[PDB]
Amino acid sequence: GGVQIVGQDETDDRPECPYGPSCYRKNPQHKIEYRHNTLPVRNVLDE
Ligand SMILES: [Zn+2]
């Protein structure tokens, strides 16, 4: 039970993929080991 993004799996502290904007790989551990930007995914307004 739970169809939202409130505690997916403690994955909010990625470091930084080297590719960055030029990253065209699709791996399961890559999306969780290295991020591709620097923005939050939940606190962007606070009301
Ligand atoms: Zn990457």
Curated annotation (Swiss-Prot):
This is Aprataxin and PNK-like factor. It comes from Homo sapiens (Human). Poly-ADP-ribosylated. In addition to binding non covalently poly-ADP-ribose via its PBZ-type zinc fingers, the protein is also covalently poly-ADP-ribosylated by PARP1. Phosphorylated in an ATM-dependent manner upon double-strand DNA break. The PBZ-type zinc fingers (also named CYR) mediate non-covalent poly-ADP-ribose-binding. Specifically recognizes branched poly-ADP-ribose chains generated by PARP2. Poly-ADP-ribose-binding is dependent on the presence of zinc and promotes its recruitment to DNA damage sites. Belongs to the APLF family. Signal peptide: none annotated. Interacts with LIG4. Interacts with PARP1. Interacts with XRCC4. Interacts (via KBM motif) with XRCC5 and XRCC6; promoting recruitment to DNA damage sites. Interacts with XRCC1. Interacts (via C-terminal disordered region) with histones; interacts with histone H2A, H2B and H3-H4. The chain holds residues 405 to 451 of 511 of the full protein. The gene is APLF. Residues 2-12 are annotated as: Flexible linker. It comes from the Eukaryota. A zinc finger (PBZ-type) spans 15-36. A glycoprotein binds at residues 19, 24-25. It is found in: Nucleus; Chromosome; Cytoplasm, Cytosol. Histone chaperone involved in single-strand and double-strand DNA break repair. Recruited to sites of DNA damage through interaction with branched poly-ADP-ribose chains, a polymeric post-translational modification synthesized transiently at sites of chromosomal damage to accelerate DNA strand break repair reactions. Following recruitment to DNA damage sites, acts as a histone chaperone that mediates histone eviction during DNA repair and promotes recruitment of histone variant MACROH2A1.
